[PDB]
Amino acid sequence: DPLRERTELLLADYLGYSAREPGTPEPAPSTPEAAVLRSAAARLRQIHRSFFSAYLGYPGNRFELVALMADSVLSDSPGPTWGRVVTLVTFAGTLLERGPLVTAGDVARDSQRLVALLSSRLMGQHRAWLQAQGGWDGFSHFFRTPFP
């Protein structure tokens, strides 16, 4: 599915960025939605710095953790929203980050596994919901909403 492939590219872009070697140049966003997701994720982490900073050097099983929560976070009432989608994806990205302050092959496979997991959850039970929102263009429009 083109919608599946577009979804997989978005998650690969963001999680790949999250997993990258510390101190290397930031890869340019591959699509508009990739740039929006990166910006939204950054704002979310700023707002909830203490919550996300706590998982930043997460030494445990990264895939297991996200796999245990992916369905409820997306599904549970009120239901799926773009806010939830960004939050779950941002959380997954946080688990993958490394760097000098944090430390104070494996990452590659984990990011691949998370791309596959999250794509499947989105294209699985919430596919209809995603299409009704206008797909990833809807996503981009949603978070570009002008502010006061």
Partner: peptide
């Protein structure tokens, strides 16, 4: 089962974040 609690916070965080953009 710690996943149940973290999922809870991720859910709250996401719903709040969504509300900032919902509509405006």
């Amino acid at each position: 089962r710690p996943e149940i609690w973290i999922a809870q916070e991720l859910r709250r965080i996401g719903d709040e974040f969504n509300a900032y953009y919902a509509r405006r």
